[PDB]
């Protein structure tokens, strides 16, 4: 068994945290996979045929192409249940606004707009959960789907805000920092992350 994954070429689309979420899921389930790069920044109709919104990642499972990383990891969970990555529904929303807050802050040219505070507000909510719930991960001792969704977002956050704004996560958010190190140090992450240079380049137009 070998899962086909369509991701963006680093030169044309950058690094995608939603693609790395899928790849992490395959790694953690030890599912073999082959990565096919999509060279196009445009949307040729054969690509919109496999992916209605013209987005990566897309995955080929059971001879059919399926887009959307939320759908993809859920379908991989149903097809390959061991090891289980099911996140208990009550933790599904943990960290959910962080990535969006980071993009606004990264984009912002007005240091007075409140974007930085909005991001710290979301990081603090993650910190509250991690300090008051057994770790290392959001749901406990075992890694689950919510952790593989957050990890590439935390990675892009730290890399991109460190380069474009020499901004780092506040030192007082020690649980968040231990959480990211625990995720970044995993074999699945080291084998699916992009060079910092790719991350930085992917975001240059937005800054
Ligand atoms: N909700 C989708 C989001 C996927 C997504 O937005 N991918 C971006 C790259 S990070 C993309 O393909 N953008 C294509 C474009 O419109 O340029 C998912 O989880 O897979």
Numbering used by the authors: 5 to 211
Describing publication, verbatim:
Cellular compartments maintain a reducing environment by constant recycling of oxidized antioxidants back to their reduced forms, a reaction catalyzed by glutathione reductase (GR) in the case of oxidized glutathione (GSSG) and dehydroascorbate reductase (DHAR) for dehydroascorbate (DHA), the oxidized form of AsA11. Whereas GSH is relatively stable in its oxidized form, DHA undergoes irreversible hydrolysis to diketogluonate (DKG), and therefore, rapid reduction of DHA in cells is critical for effective AsA recycling. Previously, DHAR has been reported to have a bi-uni-uni-uni ping-pong enzymatic mechanism, with GSH and DHA interacting with the catalytic cysteine (Cys20 in AtDHAR2) in separate, sequential binding events. AtDHAR2 crystallized as a monomer and exhibited the classic structural architecture common to the GST super-family, with an all-helical C-terminal domain, and a thioredoxin-like N-terminal domain consisting of a mixture of β-sheets and α-helices.
The crystal structure of AtDHAR2 in complex with GSH was solved by molecular replacement to a resolution of 2.3 Å in space group P21221. GSH was placed into the available electron density of the mFO-DFC difference map at the G-site of AtDHAR2 at full occupancy in a non-covalently bound state. The cysteinyl sulfur of GSH was in close proximity (2.8 Å) to the sulfur atom of Cys20, thereby indicating that the GSH was likely engaged in a mixed disulfide (for which a maximum bond length of 2.3 Å is commonly applied) with Cys20 before disulfide cleavage by X-ray irradiation, a well-characterized phenomenon. The GSH γ-glutamyl is particularly well stabilized, as evidenced by low B-factor values of 24–29 Å2, accepts H-bonds to its carboxylate from a water molecule and from the backbone amide and side-chain hydroxyl of Ser73, and forms a salt bridge interaction with Asp72 via its amine group. The central cysteinyl region of the GSH molecule is stabilized by hydrogen bonding of the carbonyl and amide of the cysteine with the backbone amide and carbonyl groups of Val60. The glycinyl group of GSH is less tightly bound, as reflected by elevated B-factors of 39–48 Å2, forming a single salt bridge with the side-chain amine of Lys47 through its carboxylate. The overall structural fold of AtDHAR2 is almost identical to that of the structures of OsDHAR1 and PgDHAR1, albeit with the inclusion of an additional short-chain helical turn preceding the α1-helix. The introduction of the α1’-helix in AtDHAR2 alters the peptide torsion of Asp19 in such a way as to re-direct its side-chain carboxylate toward the protein interior, forming a hydrogen bond with His160. However, although Lys8 is conserved in AtDHAR2, it is instead positioned at the beginning of the β1-strand, distal from the active site cleft and 19 Å Cα-Cα from the positioning of Lys8 of OsDHAR1, and the equivalent position occupied by a glycine.
